[PDB]
Design a protein around this ligand. Structure first.
Ligand SMILES: CCCCCCCCCCCCCCCC(=O)OC[C@H](CO[C@@H]1O[C@H](CS(=O)(=O)O)[C@@H](O)[C@H](O)[C@H]1O)OC(=O)CCCCCCCCCCCCCCC
Ligand SMILES: CCCCCCCCCCCCCCCC(=O)OC[C@H](CO[C@@H]1O[C@H](CS(=O)(=O)O)[C@@H](O)[C@H](O)[C@H]1O)OC(=O)CCCCCCCCCCCCCCC
Ligand SMILES: CCCCCCCCCCCCCCCCCC(=O)O[C@@H](COC(=O)CCCCCCCCCCCCCCC)COP(=O)(O)OC[C@H](O)CO
Lengths: 68, 54, 478, 475, 61
């Protein structure tokens, strides 16, 4: 309880103190086509490695929860 | 009979105490690994909010 | 040339595995004798009046660490190497009759480390060979030994490990406070800096080498590790490591801080006098023989500190002679006490008795014991008197009271050695506990050779001194 | 774009599939090879792009400089050494070997990717790829309750550590406008604020979990006892390699070195690691737990390489991290070889091994002494370079603590050699009194033991390598 | 052994020990009174014990 309250107070002070850069320009409405552009231009390594992540997770979970 | 006794008690002992202490400091500090994962997460959370203070 | 002295024991150690037993013992003898003979040949070609390094070898090894493989032998260093190789030959000759494959390996590795550490003109390389000496002696104390091996061995280990620390802590420091690369000695390593720091470095070197030498309050591993060690282990350990420590102290702490040594001399003389008196008075009270001999080792090593506390050209020839004399005498005494403990089966001073009568009671190891005990004390005709008198004559022009205290310490040494000889050689044999086994001919050869060398170097002492006469001049007169 | 730096990873990736499909068809397979061959090909693929090209970036999302190649080869070699040990170990257990090597190779791929990654998203993805496979490997032997409790404990600690690291990453993305890149964040925020300090500490909380810096250490003593021993061998060499690689690539390049409060934080963690991991290791009864606390201590040693970063502390850190591979793979191979034969037990059961099996003793004592820092051996020069790189910078106290802890470590490292050699036929343990009398295990043991004894004096060839790797760290 | 202390402190004063250099030295000597008092007391105590004199006389009995 005390560590949670202290960490929350610390984070709240950090959030209320730092001067974020608001950059007042309206966002984009077509937010899915942009995510589609970032999967294969910028975030290609993570998009490709998430497949192997899912495969290894499936393998290991079937092995751990198997019945024998 | 004094000197030998001194050597057998004060000098030798003074050289052994260190060792003995270093044994105790290990025998009664293993209990910091309490075996409770929630305690480990408490120590990880005490790491933060303290280095953040220092 | 020195590379041979360092590599041949290493080769024998690496060759002790994968070798058949008969060949195991024969080849150990061969390697030890070869290294020894090479040492003697080097000693003959050591042509003197040089005042510089000889047999030097320089190879660049580990540039990002300094650590150039840079050997080189001087007048202070070569007699110690010959001593180490002689003791190694003897220890291999009277090796253990159990697990005798990991013995010759470790003994040869220990000799390699000693010979390297002596003939190394590189600080970090010296420390390499020092901490190389650290562990195999732990293994020797641990496998072969007495009831209380483990404790004893552990003690030695740590008091040597800590030693390394201090030495290393005082090399790195004094290797960087002078912004010098290439830690190798007799080189860019030039102190030339402000006081209050030379003091700290000198104290670090004193406490790192005085703990192995050993000095007065840092000695508390010596009685435990000499008594719980078999006789070859005791001989090798005593000679080799004690001389390594003393050599380190003399060489480094006198060739690097001659301004701080001249200021700490006043305290080191009193510390050495207290050490001699302390060793003697603590030996007088002991009722086990090996303990008396260990405190003998402490007392005889404090003479080197008293000698070095005075910068006299004479008091350093005397220091080297005392190192050699203590090596020979401690080897003889440990060998004789090991023989006695083996044949009699007990080592106390209240059940040993009458070991000097002809037929039933061990008389040529007792005669040698009386001759080694009187050599240890100050008795002319033997080596100990020559060494101690050189030290005394060199140390009286300086502080005269610590020299007088050292003379009193020699008297007390005579006291407790007479105690041991009376309760060991004189008296009558107990006629239920007698029937000691016989002593075979090639089992009292090492004692009978050490005795001949001791009685020779005491009546014709030039052959003890003619090697370190100009080197000591180069050491102190600089 | 410039997918050449990936022909080292994709090779291993292909193996992950091929050593998997073969387990789908065959189920009694020889996949231990063509997995050693896969890692060998992945390592041999680094020679063409170690010196021939300059430093290249995938899309800003990955970099293939010499430091990246160093850490990638390090993790691949750790996996190669672990595959050898785990053949007769998990086969002796009633479990499969292909479904284990796929997980091990995926953990390897994650560790190799996290080395050269320089973007928030990809860093997170590589770290989590490592962590999930680590959990799965820890809980592999699902018959033993210790393995299951260790996997649960490790998962609950690692997932919380990853949540903290992710909070730090989100803060770091928000402070510097956008810029998920690492080098584009240093250019954006170049001033200490409260947000930057909080992000720094929250990243440290997830780094120190990987590199086992106390107080983020309390899982290794409970995971090393639980996990299968070859998993522990890969976990003490490869996981620390990935953690230190990520720490160098993150702290130096992302957190603007103007905010070098992490040097203070890591001084604290290194002092605490040296003090704890060596004092508590001194009172242990099992070999795996002793090696866990030893590993904490050695991480504390390494953490005085990049806490005084001076292009010689980085080289000292990398050299010790390279030697640590040979030391620990060889110290775990002998532990596996002993627990396989009859023992399956703790330190007290080692008493009297010199009579029955001398090769295992000569192989384990060498590695324990190397870990202790005994002259000529791989560990002595590693520690001497660590300590001189610490004096040459100004950290007297850190090095003077490292030396005392090195003595404390010599004590409990030689306490095992005690049992292995001292005993006479009456003091053999009950596990040696009936000691009986697997080729890859021996051919890995011999190799790591001959490497830990020769990479100390033949150290000059692998000092130029470390130096050309260190040339890439910013300062 | 106290004779050794005496013979040890007669060298800086006489530069030799030959019973003739000592004779010449003692002929023309003007050094401190207590110093020669002490060194000659040591030179006495040597033969004092060697010749079985009080108090070092029980050894003869
Ligand atoms: C203080 C001065 C020291 C100088 C003395 C020099 C040491 C003696 C030299 C020996 C020469 C080598 C051969 C010795 C072995 C041998 O032949 O047979 C061994 C047998 C001994 O008995 C044997 O003893 C053997 C056990 S042991 O050898 O005695 O250890 C065993 O074989 C069996 O018991 C038994 O027959 O004969 C002896 O050696 C005893 C005679 C030799 C010892 C003499 C000592 C008596 C004098 C001591 C004081 C001298 C005073 C004069 C001025 C100093
Ligand atoms: C100033 C520096 C230079 C000066 C020299 C240094 C001072 C030396 C003085 C000698 C001191 C005696 C040593 C102590 C012995 C001991 O520990 O126990 C006492 C021993 C018994 O020890 C026992 O000896 C036993 C063996 S044995 O059978 O006795 O031999 C043994 O079993 C037992 O354990 C052991 O306790 O018995 C003795 O006292 C014998 C000693 C006889 C010495 C004669 C005196 C010599 C000095 C002349 C004095 C002149 C002045 C007198 C007053 C006017
Ligand atoms: C200032 C007083 C001077 C008087 C003389 C004292 C000078 C002594 C110098 C200290 C040398 C260190 C001695 C370490 C003692 C080791 C002996 C020992 O017994 O080892 C024990 C354990 O050893 C250790 O734990 C290793 C840790 C020792 C570390 C000691 C370092 C001391 C160095 C002091 C430096 C302080 C820093 C000051 C800097 C400003 C085991 O004890 P035991 O009874 O169990 O033995 C049997 C064995 O256990 C069975 O196998």
């Amino acid at each position: 309880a005390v560590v949670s309250l202290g960490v929350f107070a610390l984070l709240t002070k950090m959030i209320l103190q730092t001067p974020w850069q608001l950059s007042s320009v309206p966002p984009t409405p077509d937010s899915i086509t942009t995510i589609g552009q970032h999967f294969f231009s910028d975030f290609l390594l993570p998009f490709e490695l998430a497949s192997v992540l899912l495969l290894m997770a499936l393998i290991g979970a079937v092995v751990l929860a198997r019945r024998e | 009979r004094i000197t030998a006794w001194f050597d057998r008690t004060f000098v030798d002992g003074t050289g052994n105490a260190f060792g003995v202490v270093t044994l105790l400091g290990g025998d009664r500090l293993k209990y910091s690994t309490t075996g409770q994962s929630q305690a480990y997460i408490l120590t990880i959370l005490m790491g933060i909010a303290i280095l953040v203070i220092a | 040339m020195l590379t041979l002295l360092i590599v041949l024991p290493v080769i024998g150690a690496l060759l002790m595995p994968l070798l058949p037993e008969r060949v195991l013992r024969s080849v150990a003898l061969v390697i030890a004798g070869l290294t020894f003979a090479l040492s003697l040949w080097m000693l003959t070609q050591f042509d003197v009046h040089q005042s510089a390094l000889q047999f030097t070898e320089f190879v660049p090894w580990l540039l990002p660490l300094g650590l150039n493989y840079s050997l080189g032998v001087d007048g202070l260093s070569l007699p110690l190497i010959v001593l180490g190789t002689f003791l190694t030959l003897g220890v291999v000759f009277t090796g253990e009759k159990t697990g005798q494959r990991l013995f010759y390996a470790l003994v040869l590795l220990a000799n390699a480390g000693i010979t390297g550490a002596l003939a190394a003109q590189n600080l970090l390389l010296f420390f390499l060979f020092y901490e190389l000496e650290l562990v195999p002696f732990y293994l020797l104390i641990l496998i072969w030994g007495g009831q209380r091996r483990e404790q004893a061995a552990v003690k030695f280990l740590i008091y040597t490990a800590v030693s390394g620390i201090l030495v290393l802590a005082a090399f790195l420091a004094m290797g960087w406070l002078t912004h010098a690369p290439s830690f190798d000695s007799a080189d860019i390593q030039i102190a030339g800096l402000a006081p209050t720091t030379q003091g700290i470095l000198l104290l670090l070197l004193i406490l790192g080498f005085g703990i192995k030498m050993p000095l007065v309050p840092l000695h508390s591993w010596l009685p435990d590790a000499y008594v719980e060690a078999s006789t070859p282990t005791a001989i090798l350990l005593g000679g080799a490591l004690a001389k390594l420590g003393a050599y380190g102290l003399v060489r480094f702490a006198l060739g690097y801080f001659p301004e701080a040594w001249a200021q700490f001399s006043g305290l080191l003389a009193i510390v050495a006098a207290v050490g001699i008196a302390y060793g003697a008075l603590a030996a007088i009270a002991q009722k086990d023989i090996k303990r008396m001999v260990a405190y003998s080792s402490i007392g005889h090593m404090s003479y080197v500190l008293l000698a070095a506390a005075a910068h006299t050209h004479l008091s350093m020839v005397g220091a080297i002679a005392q190192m050699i004399s203590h090596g020979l005498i401690l080897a003889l005494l440990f060998y004789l006490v090991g023989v006695i403990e083996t044949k009699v089966g007990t080592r106390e001073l209240n059940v040993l008795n009458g070991l000097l009568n002809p037929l039933r009671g061990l008389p040529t190891t007792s005669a040698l014991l009386i001759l080694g005990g009187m050599a240890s004390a100050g008795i002319p005709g033997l080596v100990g008197f020559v060494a101690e008198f050189l030290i005394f004559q060199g140390s009286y022009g300086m502080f005269p009271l610590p020299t007088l205290v050292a003379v009193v310490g020699t008297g007390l040494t005579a006291v407790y050695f007479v105690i041991m000889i009376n309760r060991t050689c004189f008296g009558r044999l107990d006629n239920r506990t007698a029937y000691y086994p016989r002593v075979v001919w090639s089992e009292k050869m090492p004692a009978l050779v050490l005795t001949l060398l001791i009685v020779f170097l005491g009546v014709q002492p030039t052959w003890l001194v003619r090697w370190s006469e100009t080197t000591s001049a180069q050491i102190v007169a600089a | 774009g410039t997918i050449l730096p990936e022909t080292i990873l994709i090779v291993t990736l292909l193996v992950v599939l091929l050593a998997d499909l073969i387990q789908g068809r065959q189920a009694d397979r020889w996949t231990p090879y063509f997995a050693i061959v896969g890692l060998g090909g992945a390592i041999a693929t680094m020679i063409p792009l170690w010196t021939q090209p300059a430093t290249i970036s995938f899309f800003g999302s990955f970099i293939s400089d010499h430091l990246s190649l160093f850490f990638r080869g390090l993790i691949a070699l750790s996996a190669l050494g672990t595959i050898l040990m785990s053949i007769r170990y998990v086969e002796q257990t009633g479990s499969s070997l292909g479904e284990f090597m796929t997980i091990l190779l995926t953990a390897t791929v994650g560790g190799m990717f996290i080395a050269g990654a320089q973007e928030l998203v990809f860093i997170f993805v590589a770290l989590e790829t490592l962590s999930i496979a680590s959990y799965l490997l820890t809980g592999y032997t699902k018959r033993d309750s210790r393995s299951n409790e260790a996997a649960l404990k490790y998962l609950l600690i690692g997932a919380a550590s990853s949540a903290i690291f992710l909070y730090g990453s989100s803060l770091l993305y928000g402070l510097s406008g956008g810029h998920t890149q690492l080098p584009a964040i240093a250019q954006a925020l170049s001033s200490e604020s409260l947000g930057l300090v909080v992000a720094l500490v929250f990243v440290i909380a997830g780094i120190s979990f990987k590199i086992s810096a106390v107080p983020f250490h309390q899982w290794t003593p409970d995971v090393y006892e639980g996990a299968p021993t070859p998993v522990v061998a890969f976990l003490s060499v490869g996981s620390k390699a990935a953690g230190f690689a990520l720490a160098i690539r993150f702290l130096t390049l992302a957190f603007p070195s103007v905010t070098d409060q992490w040097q203070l934080i890591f001084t604290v963690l290194a002092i605490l690691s040296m003090i704890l991991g060596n004092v508590v290791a001194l009172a242990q009864t099992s070999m795996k737990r002793m090696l866990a606390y030893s590993s904490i201590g050695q991480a504390g040693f390494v953490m005085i390489g990049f806490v005084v970063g001076t292009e010689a502390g980085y080289a000292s850190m990398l050299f010790y991290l390279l030697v640590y591979l040979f030391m620990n793979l060889g110290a775990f191979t002998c532990v596996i070889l002993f627990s396989l034969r009859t023992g399956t037990d703790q330190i007290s059961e080692y008493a009297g091994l010199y009579q029955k099996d001398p090769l295992l003793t000569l192989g384990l004592s060498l590695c324990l002494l190397s870990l202790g820092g005994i002259p000529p051996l791989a560990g002595f020069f590693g520690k001497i370079y660590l300590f001189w790189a610490g004096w040459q910078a100004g950290a007297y106290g850190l090095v003077l603590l490292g030396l005392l802890t090195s003595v404390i470590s010599i004590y409990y490292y030689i306490r095992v050699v005690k049992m292995m050699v001292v005993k006479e036929p009456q003091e053999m343990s009950e596990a040696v009194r009936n000691y009986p009398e697997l080729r890859p295990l021996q051919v890995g043991l011999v190799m790591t033991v001959i490497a830990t004894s020769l990479a100390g004096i033949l150290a000059n060839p692998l000092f130029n390598l470390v130096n050309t790797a260190v040339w890439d760290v910013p300062q | 052994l106290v004779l050794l202390m005496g013979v040890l402190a007669i060298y800086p004063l006489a530069g030799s020990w030959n019973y003739d250099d000592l004779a010449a030295w003692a002929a023309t000597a003007q050094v401190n009174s207590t110093l020669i008092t002490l060194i000659c007391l040591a030179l006495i105590a040597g033969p004092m014990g060697k010749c079985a004199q009080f108090p070092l006389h029980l050894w003869l009995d």
